[PDB]
């Protein structure tokens, strides 16, 4: 009975128009680009350190 009730409530509607909870859920987990901006910075640094590790470890004796 609960599953039938819960599923009926959580449906979007006739044509789009999501419910208030749907609006809330999509809003909190937006992260429009903040995973990309943080991954790109970290990839850039760890790429620099690889160049540095190669420069210090392969130096003329």
């Amino acid at each position: 009975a609960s599953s039938f009730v819960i599923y009926n409530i959580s449906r979007p509607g006739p044509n789009g128009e999501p419910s208030s909870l749907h609006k809330w859920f999509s809003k909190i987990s937006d992260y429009k680009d903040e995973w990309e901006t943080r991954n790109t910075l970290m990839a850039a640094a760890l790429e620099q350190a690889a160049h540095d590790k190669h420069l210090l470890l392969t130096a003329e004796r």
């Binding site: 210090l56 130096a59 004796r61």
Partner: protein, 558 residues
């Protein structure tokens, strides 16, 4: 400062014959070594491959002063073993600042703390360690053949005297005799090596020999075959003194025979100084042009010793039942790893060598400290095992068998887990520090083409992990044959402690049982700090590894 401390301690020790004064001579030795740390700490304000001092017979390098500090700290940690009584009495009523600093406790401390134990009655014991330390910090700073020979003997002769200092022990006198006799034959090889250098070069200075080797390295009546031959004999003497296979048979016997307090120092300090001196010699004796001089490199003996040390150290250790023989063989397989990074002379290998050496000296110290503390904890325990009544020198080495650690998990869980954390570091299990050390020495060898040796190291690391796990199986997989002494808790057996304020007025009187006796804080805190360093290294690694990256950058620089 080490020389001002030796002569001052010597003069005070010369005019006394009181054996109760030993406790305070070891305490002043700790304070004296702290001033040496503060002086060498100020001697790090320059970037230099090296500066020749006192007529060119000595040198200072950032690596020399860094490792003078390390030697003094390792000595300070070992000196505590004779600066503080093994056990203490602690009550919640005497635990505050007002109590520890302004109040006082009165009780019969003699049998509880072992006031008159053998270790607490050698007046010249703090003095002779200082003599060994002096020869160690001279080896690191030697720029001449003569200074090398005089420094190595200063260190060797004091190690022999340490091994023989328990004169009433028929095990210690034998071990020192074995050590002096096999150590003297080693000294002949070091002296033959330097003699053959001077007769073919006319020089005693390392830098002149370095420049003679430098000019010879170009891809007629005087071909320099002598340098790689002389250094080869010169390497045999130092290979013996670090107990690298095949010149290793003495260490299991000597480390097992002398007292455990002594083997902590004997089995650590000598390898610290010998391995540093070899590194600079390996660097400036390198070949930059593959010629016939490079085909006879003396560094091959270190590559064969490393291969032999990896195999012998892990294979022979499988059937050891005596704990100090086991730890002796475990050190042999660890110098096979140290010797492999020395033989590959690369920026990465030199950084791996500096880390392996420091982290292992610190970790093998924890293993000795835990062993000494476990023996001092069985004071409130009784055993009926027949194999323990037949043991010898039970005061010099209270723990001699791995059978004696059966069920220690039940007796002391965190002391057992500390020894577990240390032992798993010797195996190389992540996230423990000993893993990162072997990681750096496997990556250095692999990147330089020592793939065959790297495969042999990881195979013996499995073999050597077998006898490490056997010690763990004993401590945690079985119940203890050691049981609490029945008399120490009889409900009628209590010792009266008195609490006194500043002017000797009885604040309180307490009734105490054997349950109010614990380990002294100097040994519990020291064990706690090193176990944490082995465990939390992956959160505190930047400045330790950065120091080594900088030290190697100066050595290889230009």
């Amino acid at each position: 400062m080490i020389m001002i401390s030796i002569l001052s301690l010597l003069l005070s020790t010369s005019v006394t014959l009181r054996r109760d004064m030993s406790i305070l001579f070891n305490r002043i030795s700790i304070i004296a070594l702290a001033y040496c740390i503060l002086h060498d700490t100020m001697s790090l304000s320059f970037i230099s491959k090296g500066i020749g001092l006192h007529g060119g017979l000595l040198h200072i390098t950032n690596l020399t002063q860094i490792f003078h500090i390390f030697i003094f700290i390792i000595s300070i940690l070992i000196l505590q073993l004779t600066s503080f009584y093994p056990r203490k009495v602690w009550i919640p009523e005497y635990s505050s600042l007002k109590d520890i600093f302004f109040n006082k406790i009165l009780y019969y401390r003699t049998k509880i703390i072992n006031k008159m134990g053998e270790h607490m009655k050698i007046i010249e014991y703090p003095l002779i360690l200082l003599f060994v330390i002096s020869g160690a910090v001279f080896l690191i700073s030697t720029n001449d053949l003569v200074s090398i020979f005089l420094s190595i003997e200063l260190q060797s002769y004091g190690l022999y005297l340490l091994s023989t200092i328990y004169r009433n022990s028929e095990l210690s006198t034998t071990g020192g005799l074995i050590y002096f006799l096999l150590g003297g034959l080693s000294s002949c090889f070091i002296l033959l090596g330097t003699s053959l250098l001077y007769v073919n070069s006319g020089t005693t200075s390392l830098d002149g020999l370095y420049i003679l080797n430098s000019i010879s390295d170009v891809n007629s009546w005087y071909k320099p075959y002598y340098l790689n031959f002389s250094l080869l004999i010169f390497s045999i003497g130092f290979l013996f003194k670090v107990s690298a296979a095949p010149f290793h048979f003495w260490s299991p016997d000597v480390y097992d025979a002398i007292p455990t307090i002594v083997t902590t120092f004997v089995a650590i300090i000598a390898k610290i100084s010998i391995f540093i001196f070899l590194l600079e010699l390996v660097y400036y004796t390198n070949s930059n042009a593959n010629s016939y001089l490079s085909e006879f490199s003396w560094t091959y003996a270190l590559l064969i010793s490393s291969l032999l040390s990896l195999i012998i150290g892990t294979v022979v250790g499988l059937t050891q039942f005596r704990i100090k023989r086991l730890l002796a063989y475990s050190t042999i397989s660890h110098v096979g790893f140290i010797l492999l990074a020395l033989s590959v002379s690369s920026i990465e290998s030199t950084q791996a060598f500096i880390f392996y050496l420091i982290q292992y000296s610190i970790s093998n110290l924890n293993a000795f400290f835990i062993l000494i503390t476990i023996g001092f904890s069985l004071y409130g325990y009784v055993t009926n095992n027949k194999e323990y009544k037949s043991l010898l020198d039970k005061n010099n080495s209270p723990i001699q068998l791995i059978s004696q650690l059966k069920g220690y998990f039940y007796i002391n869980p965190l002391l057992s887990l500390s020894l577990a954390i240390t032992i798993f570091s010797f195996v190389g299990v992540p996230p423990l520090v000993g893993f990162f050390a072997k990681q750096m020495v496997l990556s250095a060898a692999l990147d330089n083409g020592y793939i065959f040796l790297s495969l042999i190291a990881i195979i013996t690391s499995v073999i050597g992990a077998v006898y490490y796990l056997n010690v763990i199986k004993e401590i945690f997989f079985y119940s203890p044959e050691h049981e609490v002494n029945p008399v120490l808790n009889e409900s009628d057996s209590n010792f009266s402690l008195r609490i006194l304020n500043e002017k000797n007025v009885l604040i309180r009187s307490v009734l105490l049982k054997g349950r109010n006796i614990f380990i002294s804080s100097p040994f519990s805190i020291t064990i706690s700090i090193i176990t944490n360093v082995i465990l939390l290294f992956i959160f505190m690694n930047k400045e330790w590894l950065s120091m080594g990256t900088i030290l190697v950058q100066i050595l290889f620089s230009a």
